[PDB]
Chains A and B, each alone.
Chain A
Amino acid sequence: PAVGIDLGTTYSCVGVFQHGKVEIIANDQGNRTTPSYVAFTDTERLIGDAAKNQVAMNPTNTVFDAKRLIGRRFDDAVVQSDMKHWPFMVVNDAGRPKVQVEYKGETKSFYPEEVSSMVLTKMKEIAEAYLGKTVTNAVVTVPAYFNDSQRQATKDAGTIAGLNVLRIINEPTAAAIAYGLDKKVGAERNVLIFDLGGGTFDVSILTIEDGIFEVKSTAGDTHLGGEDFDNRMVNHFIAEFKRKHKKDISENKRAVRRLRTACERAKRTLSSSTQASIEIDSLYEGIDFYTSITRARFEELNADLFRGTLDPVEKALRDAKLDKSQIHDIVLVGGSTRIPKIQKLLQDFFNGKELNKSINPDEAVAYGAAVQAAILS
């Protein structure tokens, strides 16, 4: 049976179309999405949740974000720029980047597609554990703006993972397919996909004529997501602790981490409630930190960030030489699209048009990929 795989910069998802339905396959830990992480230890190689769980213990040898290096040259501006923010080493091997790590007591380096093949092997094994059957066919998605080298490098990762890559399709196209925007009535439909998830922000405008897809334009921010919004809440609470106790917890990494984890959870709570409460005993110097934050405040702390997402929207309508009024469907993918203030800035930019979002935004792309996988199988 063929599956659909969403290879994300930080999380991946795999789905399967069975019995006329799509099933997003949970991994060994019960998660419907798996971290795109690979860790090398003195004894073993970990992939997925196991890899992410030990990042704090082995930062320099736990790789993620391979999707940012895949199919690129070392001297690529993105590479040079991104590596300044990674704990692991990126090296140059004849103009091609490789991640360098310590593995089993030795220094080893891997090409981006090798790292991604390791992640693809996990998604393959995840589907087989669920299906109790072998998996070799699959549709893997990539960003609408990926070029030949990048597309081929992804195909290659699939191959190395022993997968038969039926096709490499664009992520926004997969999201459109999931909602079935390619089977609707009328003719030439203009669709905008708002993708804010996994640490990247991508806007894509597509035209669908008799089921055929054409990407009219792409815009976004390659380093924007939930972690930036969480950080603003953390900034909020650090200041508040300073006001109430005249103590700065910012240099105690464990206090900051407990706070950050609490804020990530409160953020999720503020997507379905107007206020979230946090109780953290002995946070810093024995001081208990019991507090709460409203949805309103959360939004004020991220005002510039949330508003900024419209920059790429208008730019996409710009290069698609279309008017906001000419967009027929709006689709939300990515976890952050669950944030109501994001849904408003959007829905009202398009003066009231209802948005497509009944499908779990973290799984829409894999979902659409599963549909396509079956039809192509």
Chain B
Amino acid sequence: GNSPQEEVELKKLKHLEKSVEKIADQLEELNKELTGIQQGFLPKDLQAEALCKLDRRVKATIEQFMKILEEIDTLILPENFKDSRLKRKGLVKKVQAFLAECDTVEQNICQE
């Protein structure tokens, strides 16, 4: 019973999915920079300072994920749009798992 109407909803989710991939890349870039600093020759104090210096970026990544969740939350998917509903659930869970990694980063910088 696949309908053309559900395609319109699946496309919305695919764009959101792409947006999430982009934020995830930034989180990875952010993670490499984090390890790079941890591996760096900076003196423990300027190091702690470069780390907390990464605070702005992690908060910006967290905020972008939150805006995505808010956008996913505007969708209303009928019970019969099973594929759309499953896609929505999968995306929210992926975003939430990325949020948890961001929180782990916030726990390693500016002390904890």
State the A residues within 8 Å of B (CB): 41-42, 53-54, 56-58, 254, 257-258, 261-262, 265, 277-282, 288
A261 touches B73 (CB 8 A): yes
Which B residue sits closest to A57, measured CB to CB?
B59
B99 touches A254 (CB 8 A): yes
B76 touches A279 (CB 8 A): yes
Query: Of B59, B66, B93, which contacts A254 at CB under 8 A?
Result: B66
CB distance from A95 to the nearest CB of B (A): 35
A265 touches B74 (CB 8 A): yes
Residues facing A in B72-109 (CB within 8 A) are 72-77, 88-89, 92-93, 96, 99
Chain B, interface size category, equals 20 to 34
A258 touches B76 (CB 8 A): no
B73 touches A279 (CB 8 A): yes
Q: Report the bound CA distance from A41 to B60 in whole Å.
A: 12
CB distance from A50 to the nearest CB of B (A): 12
- 11 extra A-B contacts, CB within 8 A, seeds A254-B99, A257-B70: A54-B60, A56-B59, A57-B56, A57-B59, A57-B62, A254-B69, A258-B70, A261-B70, A265-B74, A277-B76, A279-B77
CB distance from A39 to the nearest CB of B (A): 12
Q: Does B63 contact A (CB under 8 A)?
A: yes
Query: Of B59, B70, B93, which contacts A282 at CB under 8 A?
Result: B93
CB distance from B42 to the nearest CB of A (A): 18
The answer to whether residues A281 and B66 also contact, given A41-B56, A265-B74 and a CB cut-off of 8 A, is no
Q: Report the bound CA distance from A57 to B77 in whole Å.
A: 31
The answer to whether residues A42 and B56 also contact, given A279-B76, A281-B89, A282-B96 and a CB cut-off of 8 A, is yes
CB distance from B20 to the nearest CB of A (A): 14
Chain B residues, CB < 8 A from A277: 76
Chain B residues, CB < 8 A from A265: 74
The answer to whether residues A280 and B66 also contact, given A57-B60, A254-B99 and a CB cut-off of 8 A, is no
